[PDB]
Amino acid sequence: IDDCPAKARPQHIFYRRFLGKDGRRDPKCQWKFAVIFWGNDPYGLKKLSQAFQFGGVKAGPVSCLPHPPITYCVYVYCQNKDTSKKVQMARLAWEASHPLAGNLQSSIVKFKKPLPLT
């Protein structure tokens, strides 16, 4: 937690408690699952990206989405189907608990072939 930059620490401590065992170091599992968080606010999305780094849950850098109002997004990568939806619920928890946090719309994601994270 000391290693994680300060800005996302309030979030980090929250998610660390929220997720539990399914969020920390389950090597046997394969990572087939991620969850994309998209929002117009780059600031909060960066905080979210910093917020999730774990044994079972990792998040990439902030990224733009295809435009047919720029949409920014950050993918949050998980192990199983449980933690995939649980992270989605983890953020909504923070939004409800902490009103000052922005509202982010997200969808669960399933990958067929495994991803290179272990």
Next chain:
Amino acid sequence: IDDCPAKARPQHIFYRRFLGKDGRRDPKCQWKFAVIFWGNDPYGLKKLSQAFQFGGVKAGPVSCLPHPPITYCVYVYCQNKDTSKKVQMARLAWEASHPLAGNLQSSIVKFKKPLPLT
């Protein structure tokens, strides 16, 4: 919210924000789903029971469980499979956000035949 007794109001306001549309008045849906919250603490379970009364989510009174340390439990009844697990996540959110709240272990529940709530 004025009608709901005070003790569960902090919880109520939380869940009211957490759940959203799937937690309020969806008449078309049939109630096949509930979620049981079991814990040794009657006090917190009573607060939980008072906490959930909604259009899509209703909770019965506190009840004991069969003993082969008395276990108390309160069922929380939902509409669909989404709100069933979402309520389970809603409580865990409160526990993580508010540390002073007790730890309650729970399981999602599926009913075959419909239940008389509309």
Next chain:
Amino acid sequence: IDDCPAKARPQHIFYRRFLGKDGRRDPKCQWKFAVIFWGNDPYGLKKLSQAFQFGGVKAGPVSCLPHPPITYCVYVYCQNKDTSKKVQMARLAWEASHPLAGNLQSSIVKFKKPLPLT
């Protein structure tokens, strides 16, 4: 049977014969299943609750249901899907065989995560 209070003994002896092996002591099985009996009559529901205590089948205390005419209910917890529906049929048997017994409407119940009874 001597231990079980008298009032539910006529029922108990009935269910003991009706259920058989699937109703007595199957430890290998996990309890994912229960069956809720709801009715307006507290008296008969109490008798039902006393009636079911077994190795594979356990019943909690009488409990109220959420009101949008008070409805009382008693959950009857089972091991597998077979005994879950079989108990539902076991009560209907008693109602048909013994006319004096009240009419109780019930639904089979499925739980996702296991329940703490062994």
Next chain:
Amino acid sequence: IDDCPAKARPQHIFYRRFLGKDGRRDPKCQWKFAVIFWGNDPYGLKKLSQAFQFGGVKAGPVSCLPHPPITYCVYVYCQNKDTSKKVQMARLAWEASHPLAGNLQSSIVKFKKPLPLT
């Protein structure tokens, strides 16, 4: 009930109450389902055959089974999957309720193509 011969009347009245709506006249349903009752006793099987004649449930005459102690059997034909298992439970009810009745072992049966009963 007057038309049904006397010997199976005690059974008939029982099953008539036990089965209910799913046992009487549901024309929309197709008969894909039957249930075979096999036992060594021809006497009781004949009584069973006389016992089941209904709108949704019909039973053929007593019949022998292939021998690799003669086994006699009587098929009981139903509409849906509900009534198929319900009849199986209906007999077990009679055996438990009435001890003097013999013990009959039976299995539920599924037919792919429909059967000529309407």
Next chain:
Amino acid sequence: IDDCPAKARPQHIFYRRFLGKDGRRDPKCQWKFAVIFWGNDPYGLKKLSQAFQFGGVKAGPVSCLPHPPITYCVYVYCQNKDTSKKVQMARLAWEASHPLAGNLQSSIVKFKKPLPLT
């Protein structure tokens, strides 16, 4: 074949060739499957019943069907789903090959619980 009565021998020799391995002595398999042959002609149905006796396929005696023109039927019991439909095709083969044989309408049958033949 010498043991099998003469009348069904032309049929027997036919089915013996038609069915093959799946029709003779597969003990590992459980008998969940039968096929009912129903027809108005008792004579041909008796010949059919005599025609099928095998390691994997057995047929009971001729039996009547429930009447809402008497219908007679004979069940032919199999091991797996393959032989169940194969026997249905085996008879149709005989009808097409031998025109003098009567036309019999039949359906494949599935049993949930196993049957006492081994």
Next chain:
Amino acid sequence: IDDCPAKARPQHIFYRRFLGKDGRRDPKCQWKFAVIFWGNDPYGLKKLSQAFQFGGVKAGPVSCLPHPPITYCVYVYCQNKDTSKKVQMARLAWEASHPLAGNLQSSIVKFKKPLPLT
């Protein structure tokens, strides 16, 4: 039948009777299904190919198979899953009924995208 060359007429008349409705002109159905007949004998396979031409069943010309003893094969194209296996049984019928006919080993075939026959 007059149009079909003579050599396969004995077969043709057989299959015409064996197959019935599912073998003649069902336009609503899509052809997703064929059945491949492979054998070392080109002569009999040619007769088989001539034997099957129908509204619901069509057969292509005799063709070789990949060699890692030349294997010849002829595909027989059907409408639904019923007629696909039924044709497989139709040939086995001929082999059993008529001993002089050669023994041909075959497998049912399923195609994902539809085939250009209507």
Next chain:
Amino acid sequence: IDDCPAKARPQHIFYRRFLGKDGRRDPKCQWKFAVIFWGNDPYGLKKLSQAFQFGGVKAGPVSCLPHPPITYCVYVYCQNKDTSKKVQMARLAWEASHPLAGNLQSSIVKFKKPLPLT
């Protein structure tokens, strides 16, 4: 590649690179799968047939299709469901990359019983 005739070598080298491991020598797998390429051009279909010979992928000789404009076709036999569709994509790749090549319409094929290639 030296053994394969020259005309299909440009194709062969292409498919050899395109397919990879799933296209070369996987003995453990069973061949349940093929893919049929149909087209009006016999010339290109012959080139295609010569083009595919592999450890995991084999193609038979050019063959006609049933006519209710002669259609020629060549089946390409695979191991698993992956290579079945991959070959279909492999040809489309060649058509897009090399414009001079003809346009061939094809469908993936599934066989129930295994095929004699190993």
Next chain:
Amino acid sequence: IDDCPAKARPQHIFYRRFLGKDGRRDPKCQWKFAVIFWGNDPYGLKKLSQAFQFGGVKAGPVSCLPHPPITYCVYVYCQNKDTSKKVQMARLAWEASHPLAGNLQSSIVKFKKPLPLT
């Protein structure tokens, strides 16, 4: 094609031909599907990102992946399951056809909730 920057034009023209109808303007479909291309080379990934912009297929900007040798990735978003795998095959086609192009490893991706592209 004039609008698309030059560097990815050779790719663009290729994919435009490869994909066809399923790659251009199918509004009725919902976008549940994307495909992630990950590789160590930022240069080629940028070319890939520029290469895919279509009615049915859109690609976001180049993005990094979580590190437990920096991995860069670019997501390519599709409509249905067909185009999702087809794009994966579309790139492999280019790699096989054009050797000078780098080798990129990728996996198909499924999203539960729809994505905001129409």
